[PDB]
Design a protein around this ligand. Structure first.
Ligand SMILES: *C(=O)CCCCCCCCCCCCC
Ligand SMILES: *C(=O)CCCCCCCCCCCCC
Lengths: 300, 60, 300
């Protein structure tokens, strides 16, 4: 059973191997042009609804009307799919937010943001387990005389940093889960000094993506940019991502949506402009499991 | 949309089948059959209200 | 185009017909052993889960364990089917009632009785239209020394009579629709005489099936009998019945369940006995349509 193979050589002969043990774990580590501009691993680079082979975007009775599409991205090059081997899952439009010359950014979590959306939300709380992918459609228009740029980031397991410097990992379930409402980024860290009666919530610094890493590198995550000059909307198609095939939607949030001003909003000459950002999100290829009496969370 | 070329915007057109409170807010209109219209991109917008009825025919 | 055919004769020659008009409506009316015990039209006679070709009775996570089955009936010989050309629809057990030596009977309406049952109820109120069939399982056990007989009747369009003698068809939506709770029969008609502030509710006399017809004839309706001597439970499989393929579940109740003591409860020698009757009902081959914001009824 001796295994002979080519040695790791320079560029101007081989070695032999025998496995002594029954468990593979015991085994030694087995070590494995024209156009430079081309990506080695495209999918890791944020492809388009176009770029993997896949306008009126429609789910159930809900439907987006979109010319914008080169502005879309399929996370990790992977399209949503059923746990293999429903019109509760449709497009829900969340409460519109306002972008101003001084906004630092906004965040949301999935499924959390959708927890009260019609039959979807119901299905979520009546079952132990649930899984779902998403289509995130960020809407934000302005004039040809306005300027600015939004960075729309979809982060897997988006754990955010807390307000305390005396204790760690202590943000309350209530605070961690804002629902549709949102949750927002800040320009500076402000430690919750109230010892006795703790705020127990996140303190997300913008240039650190609220998680201890530099915002400039947030682009290694599935993302899209809204440049007011060229486009008014972004569409992110998100797959179910997890260390499990299915999980508790109530205990665990799979994806995080982060929206930050890469370039600040500016208009004509007004000292203080504003424009709306509307998020319409739809759950995809979704399925639930382990039906029983309804979960009634202490959200407060 | 008969406004100017420099004008931009997004509108939501909605249809709600009968049986509940008539929609007074986007939040509830959102929940039924709907279309999102981008004014800036195209000047006009069509929405089909599909036949959905309990009875075979409705009265005039 | 003259049509020649055999005349309606005695038993010891024909006539001619021509249609003069373009609309069929204008047309004249076109007029069409061994063992006597056999039924001409069986299906009209209340068949068994057995008798048309169709123990653990199971829907989704819900499951009945039944030996009793010759005690089942498929209404109108017709099994539930999808509107042709889901685990919200499972077995729900309603609040148990008590049968006593003086009970006159009980009634319920479908879908109404199920309006608050988990995801079923939700689905019902989020949609304009819905249709469903049902499996009604009536449970009622006693001892070999107890006696009595329950008549379980499934009535299509079970319109019930009201409490007023000054005005008609006036029972309020609230009163007409009791939900799971029930609704009950009475031995005597008691006219709501409060003119100014009307009770606006039903007054269902038992021997008149609460509808002006004699109880003894209620058996022309899909039914089953629980004879304490021979069996402790009854199962009725109900098809969607209506003048339409689908309708408003909120405005209209399709089936009525009526349970009446054909023979009064009696035990050993106790002057006043009691035994429980539990109803477990499951919606079948069910489907909904016309999703929108939720219906919030004024049930009170
Ligand atoms: C395939 O492996 C057959 C040739 C094996 C060469 C024999 C010498 C190997 C000595 C180690 C075997 C004992 C280790 C558990
Ligand atoms: C088939 O109908 C051909 C033979 C018809 C016999 C002709 C006489 C029928 C006279 C009545 C026809 C006019 C009524 C609209």
């Amino acid at each position: 059973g001796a295994q002979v193979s080519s040695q790791k050589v320079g560029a101007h002969i081989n070695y032999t191997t025998i496995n002594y043990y029954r468990d593979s774990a015991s085994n030694a580590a087995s070590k494995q042009i024209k156009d430079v501009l081309i990506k080695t691993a495209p999918m890791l680079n944020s492809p388009n609804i176009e770029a993997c082979g896949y306008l009126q975007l429609t789910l159930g009775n809900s439907t987006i009307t979109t010319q914008e599409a080169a502005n879309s991205v399929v996370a990790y090059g992977r399209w949503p799919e059923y746990l293999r081997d429903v019109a509760a899952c449709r497009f829900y439009t969340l409460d519109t937010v306002s972008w101003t010359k001084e906004s630092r950014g906004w965040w949301w979590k999935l499924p959390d943001a959708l927890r009260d959306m019609g039959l979807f939300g119901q299905n979520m709380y009546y079952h132990y387990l649930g899984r779902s992918g998403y289509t995130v459609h960020v809407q934000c228009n302005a004039s040809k005389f306005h300027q600015g740029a939004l960075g729309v980031f979809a982060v897997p397991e988006m754990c955010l940093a807390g307000d305390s410097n005396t204790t760690t990992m202590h943000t309350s379930y209530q605070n961690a889960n804002p629902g549709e409402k949102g949750g927002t980024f800040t320009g500076t860290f402000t430690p919750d000094n109230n010892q006795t009666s703790p705020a127990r919530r996140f303190c997300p610094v913008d240039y650190l993506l609220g998680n201890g890493t530099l915002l400039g590198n947030a682009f290694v995550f599935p993302h899209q940019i809204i440049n007011l000059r060229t486009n008014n909307c972004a569409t992110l198609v998100l797959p179910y991502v997890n260390s499990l095939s299915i999980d508790s939607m109530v205990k665990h949030n799979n994806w995080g949506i982060a929206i930050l001003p890469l370039a600040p909003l500016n208009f004509a000459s007004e000292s203080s402009p504003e424009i709306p950002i509307t998020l319409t999100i739809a759950p995809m290829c979704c399925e639930f499991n382990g039906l029983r009496n309804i979960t009634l969370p202490r959200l407060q | 949309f008969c406004g100017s070329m420099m004008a931009t915007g997004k509108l939501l057109v909605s249809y709600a089948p009968p049986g509940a409170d008539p929609p007074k807010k986007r939040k509830e209109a959102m929940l039924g059959t709907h279309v999102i219209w981008d004014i800036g991109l195209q000047s006009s917008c069509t929405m089909v209200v599909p036949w959905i009825s309990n009875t075979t025919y409705r009265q005039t």
